[PDB]
Design a protein around this nucleic acid. Structure first.
Ligand SMILES: [Mg+2]
Ligand SMILES: [Zn+2]
Ligand SMILES: [Zn+2]
Ligand SMILES: [Zn+2]
Ligand SMILES: [Zn+2]
Lengths: 66, 255, 34, 528, 98, 98, 115, 521, 44, 39
RNA sequence: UUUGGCAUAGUUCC
């Protein structure tokens, strides 16, 4: 839905890295290099960014009730 | 029948990381300190949310749960505060909590990111760690609105994991398997530890029957709330107060 | 003009084109339309 | 019509007289709890606060019952009703007047279920009498029916979404009946086959073998812990076997403390050869088989499914027949707790390293498979040249199929034997197979070497299309691959035709499972 | 009313004669997950009695290669009688042979 | 006017046929929704494909212990006009005559 | 629904005593200590410190159920020495070790930064 | 065949069969025949060429598509009984090539042999390393996992709906999931699973879950339920009053507004009144609707409208967040189902050298008898992918993915090649003697929770015709004491318990009878 | 009592015994407005 | 080649005069038992 | 502090 604030396994904060990760990918980076640059060191933290599916972008399409 | 004489050496010390080596200590003491890092170090975190208006695409419990996990800098005032169950106030007073306020509305044609930058506290020393990017809370369309009031109590990681002050506590003893505490079916497939003191050909240290685990290696990484030296000191003082209160109660019971 | 040992991408290009053209519930829609 | 009302199931007689819905019943999910006794069940606080038992007021308990009534229906250790001698009911769910709270002997107070209450626990279907046994209530925080693990075998219950039923007897007479007749420790040995109906199940069983190996030497602190988990322990730490240069105990030296009384038994490990009993070293047993228990001490041997299991004459069976239910219950509980807390030191796992073989073994398996395929080809050539001679009592097709299936079975068995004998002493498949916990040598063979032939209705895969199995084969192809002999193991993976043939093979098992159940139930009902 | 009733209840026939009418058509769409929705929308059915002990039509015939999934089937009283289309399978719509 | 016929979603005669994802989002319809179901009294109905034996073909079977040895049936239908089926059998009596 | 609140794992309620002392009647000079609202974090240190004492013959601990917060410690000591004295000495030695460790860690921090 | 391939006179849907032996030609234009596309092999070379592949891979802004591929005579539709006169090849570049001659007259070729699997079985990774019953079980359990089921769930008043907080796409995915859109609406979370026997609470298909991970949002979801009521005397939506209405209960009417409907955002506990409706008894009768017992949800949305006829209509939705307890049911993508056994905090779970405690611990005894090796291979491939940065490919029949290649790839990141890792005990801090197999596997949270299954009864409501307890957990009914159970009690011999269960616990009664005629008097 | 229209998003007063119609847009689906009562969420 | 298991149990419990696979094991007396000729 | 029933479909567990 929206990127979680903490990494489930260890608790490192990954909730401030999604925009930077997407920007690095758009700037012609591989996913491994982007994750290395963002400081995500262990695979528990890396999977939080690798496997994330951002549905709030789709949810923002529909108009609000008011 | 007496105590040990532990010694320390700090290999690396940065703003989010402390690596040190404890020596001449028992494995039980080292592991108890390791456990106290995670669980029983008091931290300030949001524990009471009242949502005035939420027209966003996430429900109120979702937003409150996200708010709870934003770390607040409790470097110096975590000792001054009192537990809300231990305070003389009715519900909340400045001596036992910190109040936050969020009020964001979107009136533009571009999606707006509500971040932890928008959380405003009354006390200037308890602010989100991304306020000297930002922790995203929710995204708003045009016309959507969010507004709430939140209170930041004091607690430790045994109660909830939002008061856990650490990110990953690496603990390791006897990097070369001289004590044979773990037995490798094939010793040469296993990568050498970072602290190994062996050559490129030998895989395991020779057996040491008359040895006990000493020289524990730590690496305490902080999640931004406390700084990684006060995490260690508060654990040594925090464990020491548990033992002292046990001794007081035993003395009453014996007499 | 053969496609040798490059087949593991050609077959999936073909399958992707199939599912872009038709979809997954084409049977119900086509039957009701007819 | 009235005949329809009385006719069959859901009809009056057979649906409301021979079986009917009852009060004081609960049903929720069951989850494991190795810290309970054999005859205990964990109950959530909600169910206990909802179910009540009527206790008669006497001078021995009038104060306690009055305090329960004072607590009332709100607080869990409370009560719901007060029943007068005349029979008129007094409510306690709301706020009552202080006059009705008066208690005198001869009254009845319907208190909430508490610890130590006796209940009957059941899992449907109820096949044998070991499916409805009496348990003792213990109240635990969360909301599932915690029950021990050795009691899994009587119920045939695993903890994947299962549920079980709770029935609470309401009178002292029926409570004493259930206590003296249907309690779990009293049903350890079944009268169906005079064997113990419950035994160690697969996790204490995969670990007691490792505990009882010769190599296990225990430090002083580990012995302290393990003895701390022993409920039937005298209080004296036995002399260590190895006394110098460092005091070391042994796994057998502590299982001896677990074993009760003075039990004499002689079993045999599952890897005991056929020469030790004959040649020399009969009583020395180089591989540490030939379990011997003298005077309640494990002198020698490795404990496995054949010693602690649910077979006749096992160690648990001897313990029952010699000491009684009250001591066999403690036997089970102590074995489980001690072995689990030791397993917290040794650990257990299963992985790809445990499912991978050696290059020489792979070469052997591939050679055997190629030889078998060549032999099948030769048999087919001889049959085509009409040189095959029929076996008496069999048709030409029957004898050809028998020869082909025999060759393929020999190939599969030889590859399986190679895979077995190429294992290691640290392999976790071997750990879980030798100890009898879960698995079999055929499963190890299918994982490592060869999945084997797939059969439909007892015959090879039939010709679904016109004279061929699939559109990928020529017509009239009787090779091993055409009719569904999977040459690959599960680790290497199956080619698409073998995948489809394997699915066809597994469909038969699913169908038989879904079919046999109703007929078995009907047969049992007719016999009853 | 006829079309609405037959689609609403699933008894394929007239309301007066819902005895021999074959029930089980027109089920209510599953919405637990997207995979549930798709596998519901691509589903077959064999009208053989679910209590029939003879289980030859319940087996996996050789001719289901690429037409019907070899794995996806319910378990219980309808094992092998409810099936699902393969991924690339198509069903003809019909024409006239003029 | 002779009545109202239910319409299958996303079909050629629905209001969502051919619309783009932006229009679907405007109508509060999920662009990922596959369609292919009816809306009857609010609920969503799905027709289940029903297997049947092929028509207009001659099949020769045999019965276990019946009077005839071999049978042959031709389930006959006319271009989906009417008269659904008419299964004519051409049997052959067994050799166990008394 | 039946979820206990999180604070019940470390908060003594109205009536509960922190530690209760009971004797063991099976063996002379044995004693059992029951501690409420504690876990391995304290049990392990106290056991490992009791084992260092040369006049302690037995020293163990166990948690009877992971869902119920309570620690049981059993210690048996040689005559002319009591398990209560052994327990109190163990706690005192642990406190001394922790204080020394904290002092040395603080001086090590001071040496590391600005030094 | 030439005319059908040109698509000139005979539509591509028509099938043609020649029975060479029996001298018959059969042509079908019927509706209902099931067919699948196949590639065409002319002599020994596919008619599909690199020019076709390039024109397809430029599919955008080129109006070249599957129809233009079919019209070129490259692919073809083959129904079931035309497949009996065709020779197929599973893989072109492997079966068309020169070998020891098996068949040199191939007539078609398979696009990819993994297109024989359905929608629900296309999500299993490495299905060719599994067992067929396990694949069937996963096909069953894939329809019960909880994830976002549709993107517009906020305007749907569905009777029951379940949506996960933070779904993730698999780190080990099949190539054919892009067509099922499992990347866009997934259902599950990648969890660090360790296969070990830790404290005995995962025995017999149970799961140990990290409680600290759960506190951070791991496998949390919402539950939406909708209630409806229309005012079909004169039923009216109105707020009842205690001392003016005939029918009444022990519930609270103070939540309602003036018209008798709860406004959204109002927390309602079990056994409350949502919609207040009253019938004018010819002086008012209460027919209010009540929450299903013990929900404790918050009103989410209220919709007021008119039905077909013209009566006022209302649908009210209630939400309740479901935090994974110790009774909830979880399953992976390999037919391994289990319920949570107990939850440990982070300080108690075993840890690696780097402080990585597992999210889930599963018993090692589940593997040897079930033979789900796809589970282990998925774990290994996920451990490689989370470090490398790519997303692993687990399409069934590959020949370019081996356990050896995966292990070699994993050994280059500092880990043991076969996946094991030295863990430390949580309570004591000591190394565990046996190394544990740990890695990121993709788990699912099934629909079956414990809060929707717990049920108890003690003297509740009673049926009308038989005066026996009701049936149904929603109606506070009892548990049936069937004939098998009474036979078991007969075998036990507990005559008094059996009589209590069949008479006293159920309906008791008294009658009078005449001593002369056996007829009730 | 104020209901928000589901199409034009305009709130309008509607009392009991009144057809549920929307002014200036002619719609027939109306949604209740969020309550003014305050509810407290733990941030867990 | 006979019937075993559930069908056999069904037949033995509800005895029918027409079993599915009736059989009749026969033992020979003298030299017919050993020599294949009289066998 | 009072009690609707019939049918069909799907699912869980042996
Ligand atoms: Mg089960
Ligand atoms: Zn992490
Ligand atoms: Zn205060
Ligand atoms: Zn009379
Ligand atoms: Zn409007």
């Amino acid at each position: 839905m929206i990127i979680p604030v903490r990494c489930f396994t260890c608790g490192k904060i990954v909730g401030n890295k999604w925009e930077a990760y997407l920007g690095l990918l758009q700037a012609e980076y591989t996913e491994g290099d982007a994750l290395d640059a963002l400081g995500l060191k262990r695979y528990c933290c890396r999977r939080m960014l690798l496997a994330h599916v951002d549905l709030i972008e789709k949810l923002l399409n529909y108009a609000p009730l008011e | 029948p007496y105590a040990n004489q532990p010694t320390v050496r700090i290999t690396e010390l940065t703003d989010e990381n402390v690596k040190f080596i404890i020596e001449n200590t028992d494995l039980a003491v080292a592991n108890s300190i390791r456990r106290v890092f995670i669980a029983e170090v008091p931290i300030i975190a949001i524990d009471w949310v009242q949502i005035d208006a939420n027209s966003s695409v996430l429900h109120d419990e979702f937003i409150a749960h996200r708010l709870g996990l934003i770390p607040l800098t409790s470097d110096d005032i975590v000792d001054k505060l009192q537990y809300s169950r231990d305070c003389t106030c009715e519900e909340f007073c400045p001596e036992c909590s910190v109040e936050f306020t969020l009020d964001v509305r979107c009136n533009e044609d571009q999606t707006r990111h509500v971040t932890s930058r928008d959380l405003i506290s009354n006390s200037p020393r308890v602010i989100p760690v991304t306020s000297r990017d930002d922790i995203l809370i929710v995204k708003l369309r045009k016309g959507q609105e969010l507004r709430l009031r939140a209170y930041a109590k004091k607690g430790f990681g045994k109660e909830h994991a939002k008061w856990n002050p650490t990110a990953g506590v690496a603990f390791e003893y006897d990097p070369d398997n001289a004590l044979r505490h773990t037995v490798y079916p094939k010793p040469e497939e296993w990568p050498k530890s970072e602290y190994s003191e062996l050559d490129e050909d030998e895989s395991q240290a020779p057996y040491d029957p008359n040895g006990k685990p000493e020289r524990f290696y730590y690496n305490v990484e902080s999640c931004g709330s406390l700084r990684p030296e006060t995490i260690v000191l508060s654990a040594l003082s925090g464990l020491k107060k548990k033992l002292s209160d046990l001794q007081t109660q035993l003395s009453h019971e014996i007499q | 003009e053969i496609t040798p040992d490059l087949w593991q991408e050609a077959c999936w290009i073909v399958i992707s084109s199939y599912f872009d053209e038709k979809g997954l519930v084409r049977q119900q829609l086509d039957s009701f339309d007819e | 019509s009235l005949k329809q009302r009385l006719k069959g199931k859901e009809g009056r007689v057979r649906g409301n007289l021979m079986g009917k819905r009852v009060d004081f019943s609960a049903r929720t999910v069951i989850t494991p709890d190795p810290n309970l006794s054999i005859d205990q069940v964990g109950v959530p606080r909600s169910i206990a606060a909802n179910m009540t038992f009527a206790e008669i007021v006497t001078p021995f308990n009038i104060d306690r019952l009055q305090e329960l009534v004072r607590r009332g229906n709100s607080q869990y250790p409370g009560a719901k009703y007060i029943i007068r001698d005349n029979g008129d009911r007094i409510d306690l769910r709301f706020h009552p007047k202080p006059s009705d709270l008066h208690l005198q002997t001869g009254y009845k107070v319907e208190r909430h279920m508490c610890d130590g209450d006796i209940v009957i626990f059941n899992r449907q279907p109820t096949l044998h009498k070991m499916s409805m046994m009496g348990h003792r209530v213990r109240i635990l925080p969360w909301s599932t029916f915690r029950l021990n693990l050795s009691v899994t075998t009587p119920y045939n219950a695993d903890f994947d979404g299962d549920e079980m039923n709770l029935h609470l007897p309401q009178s002292l007479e029926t409570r004493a009946e259930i206590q003296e007749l249907a309690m779990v420790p009293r049903m350890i040995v079944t009268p169906q086959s005079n064997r113990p109906v419950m035994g160690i199940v697969q996790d204490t069983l995969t670990a007691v073998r490792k505990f009882t190996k010769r190599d296990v030497f225990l430090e002083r602190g580990e012995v302290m812990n393990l003895l701390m988990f022993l409920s039937t322990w005298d209080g004296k730490v036995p002399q260590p076997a190895i006394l110098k240069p460092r005091p070391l105990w042994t796994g057998k030296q502590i299982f001896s403390l677990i074993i009760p009384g003075h039990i004499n038994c002689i079993r045999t490990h599952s890897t005991h050869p056929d020469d030790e009993d004959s040649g020399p070293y009969k009583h020395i047993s180089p591989g540490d088989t030939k379990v011997v228990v003298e005077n309640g001490e494990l002198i020698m041997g490795i404990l496995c499914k054949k010693s602690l299991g649910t077979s006749a004459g096992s160690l648990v069976h001897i313990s029952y027949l010699e000491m009684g239910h009250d001591i066999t219950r403690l036997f089970y509980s102590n074995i489980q707790t001690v072995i689990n807390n030791w397993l917290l030191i040794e650990g257990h796992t299963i992985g790809i390293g445990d499912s991978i073989a050696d290059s020489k073994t792979y070469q052997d398996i591939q050679n055997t498979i190629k030889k078998a395929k060549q032999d099948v080809i030769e048999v087919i050539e001889k049959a085509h040249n009409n040189e095959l001679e029929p076996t008496p009592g069999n048709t030409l097709r029957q004898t050809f199929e028998n020869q082909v299936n025999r060759i393929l079975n020999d190939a599969r068995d030889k590859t399986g034997s190679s895979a077995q004998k190429s294992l290691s002493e640290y392999n976790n498949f071997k750990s879980m197979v030798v100890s009898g916990a879960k698995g079999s040598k055929i499963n190890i063979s299918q994982v490592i070497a060869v999945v084997g032939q797939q059969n439909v209705e007892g015959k090879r895969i039939p010709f679904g299309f016109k004279h061929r199995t699939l559109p990928h084969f020529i017509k009239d192809d009787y090779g091993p691959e055409s009719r569904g002999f999977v040459e690959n193991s599960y680790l290497a993976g199956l080619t698409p035709t073998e995948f489809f043939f394997h699915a066809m093979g597994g469909r038969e098992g699913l169908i038989d499972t879904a079919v046999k159940t109703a007929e078995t139930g009907y047969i049992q009902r007719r016999l009853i | 009313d006829g079309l609405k009733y037959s689609l609403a209840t699933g008894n394929w026939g007239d309301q007066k004669k819902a005895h021999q009418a074959r029930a089980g058509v027109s089920q209510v769409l599953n919405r637990l997950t997207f995979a549930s929705t798709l596998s519901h929308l691509r589903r077959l059915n064999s009208p053989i009695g679910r209590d029939g002990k003879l289980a030859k039509p319940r087996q996996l015939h050789n001719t289901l290669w690429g037409m019907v999934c070899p794995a996806e089937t319910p378990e219980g009283h309808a094992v092998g009688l409810v099936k699902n289309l393969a991924l690339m399978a198509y069903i003809s719509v019909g024409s006239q042979p003029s | 006017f002779i009545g109202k016929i239910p319409i299958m979603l996303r079909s050629t005669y629905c209001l969502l046929n051919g619309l783009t994802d932006r229009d679907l989002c405007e109508l509060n319809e999920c662009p990922l929704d596959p369609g292919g179901y009816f809306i009857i009294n609010g609920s969503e109905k799905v027709l289940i494909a029903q297997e049947k034996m092929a028509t207009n073909t001659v099949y020769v079977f045999a019965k276990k212990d019946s009077k005839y040895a071999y049978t042959g049936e031709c389930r006959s239908c006319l271009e989906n006009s009417s008269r659904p089926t008419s299964t004519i059998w051409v049997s052959m009596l067994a050799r166990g005559g008394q | 629904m039946n979820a206990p609140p999180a604070f019940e794992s470390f908060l003594l309620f109205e009536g509960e005593k922190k530690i209760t002392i009971n004797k063991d009647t099976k063996v002379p000079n044995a004693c059992l200590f029951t501690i409420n609202k504690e876990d391995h974090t304290l049990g392990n240190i106290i056991k490992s410190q009791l084992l260092k004492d040369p006049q302690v013959l037995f020293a163990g601990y166990k948690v009877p159920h992971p869902l119920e917060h309570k620690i049981i410690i059993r210690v048996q000591t040689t005559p002319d020495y009591s398990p209560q004295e052994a327990f109190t000495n163990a706690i005192t030695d642990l406190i001394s070790e922790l204080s020394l460790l904290e002092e040395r860690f603080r001086v090590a921090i001071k040496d590391k930064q600005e030094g | 065949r030439k005319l059908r391939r040109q698509m000139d006179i005979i539509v591509s849907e028509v099938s043609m069969i020649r029975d060479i032996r029996e001298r018959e030609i059969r042509i079908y234009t019927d509706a209902g025949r099931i067919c699948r596309p196949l590639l065409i092999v002319e002599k020994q070379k596919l008619l599909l060429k690199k020019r076709h592949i390039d024109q397809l891979k430029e599919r955008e802004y080129n109006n070249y598509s599957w129809q233009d591929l079919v019209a070129s005579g490259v692919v073809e539709y083959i129904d079931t009984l035309e497949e009996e006169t065709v020779m197929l090849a599973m893989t072109p570049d492997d079966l068309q090539e020169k070998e020891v001659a098996y068949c040199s007259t191939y007539t078609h070729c398979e696009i990819h042999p993994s297109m024989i699997l359905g929608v629900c079985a296309s999500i299993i990774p490495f299905p060719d390393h599994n067992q067929s019953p396990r694949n069937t079980y996963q096909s069953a359990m894939g329809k019960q996992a909880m994830g976002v089921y549709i993107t517009n769930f906020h305007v749907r008043m569905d009777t029951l709906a379940h949506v996960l907080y933070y779904p993730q796409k698999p780190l080990v995915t099949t190539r054919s999931m892009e067509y099922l859109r499992f990347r866009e609406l997934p259902a599950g979370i990648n969890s660090i699973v360790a296969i070990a026997s830790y404290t005995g609470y995962n025995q017999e298909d149970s799961v140990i879950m990290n409680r600290s991970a759960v506190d951070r949002g791991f496998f949390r979801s919402v539950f939406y339920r909708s209630y409806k009521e229309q005012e079909s005397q004169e039923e009216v939506f109105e707020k009842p009053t205690r001392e003016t209405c005939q029918g009444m209960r022990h519930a609270i009417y103070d939540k309602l507004d003036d018209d008798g409907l709860i406004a959204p955002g109002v927390r309602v506990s079990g056994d409350d009144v949502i919609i207040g409706k009253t019938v004018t008894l010819p002086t008012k009768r209460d027919c209010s609707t009540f929450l299903r017992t013990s929900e404790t949800g918050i009103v989410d949305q209220v919709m007021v409208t008119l039905n077909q006829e013209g009566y006022k209509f209302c649908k009210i939705r209630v939400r309740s967040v479901r935090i994974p307890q110790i009774g909830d049911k979880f399953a992976s993508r390999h037919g391994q189902k289990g319920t949570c056994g107990i939850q440990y905090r982070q300080e108690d779970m075993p840890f690696t050298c780097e402080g990585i405690t597992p999210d889930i611990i599963i018993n090692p005894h589940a593997i040897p008898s079930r033979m789900t090796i796809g589970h282990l291979i998925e774990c290994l491939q996920g451990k490689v992918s989370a470090n490398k940065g790519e997303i692993g490919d687990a399409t069934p029949f590959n020949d370019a993915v081996n356990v050896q290649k995966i292990s070699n790839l994993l050994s280059d990141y500092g880990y043991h090649l076969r996946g094991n890792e030295v863990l430390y005990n949580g309570f004591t801090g000591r190394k565990i003697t046996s190394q544990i197999f740990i890695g990121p596997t993709y788990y699912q949270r099934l629909k079956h929770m414990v809060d929707d299954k717990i049920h108890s009864r003690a003297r509740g409501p009673i049926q009308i015709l038989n005066r026996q307890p009701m049936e149904g957990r929603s109606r506070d009914g009892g548990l049936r004491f069937g004939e098998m159970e009474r036979d078991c009690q007969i075998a036990h011999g507990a005559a008094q318990f059996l009589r209590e269960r069949l008479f006293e616990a159920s309906d008791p009664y008294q009658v009078h009878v005449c001593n002369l005629c056996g007829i009730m008097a | 009592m104020i209901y928000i229209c589901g199409e034009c998003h305009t709130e309008n007063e509607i009392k009991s015994r009144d057809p549920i119609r929307c002014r200036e847009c002619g719609y027939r689906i109306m949604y209740k407005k969020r309550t003014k009562r305050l509810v407290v969420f733990d941030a867990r | 080649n006979v019937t075993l298991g559930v069908p056999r149990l069904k037949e033995l419990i509800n005895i029918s005069k027409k079993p599915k696979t009736p059989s009749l094991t026969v033992f020979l007396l003298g030299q017919s038992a050993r020599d294949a000729e009289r066998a």
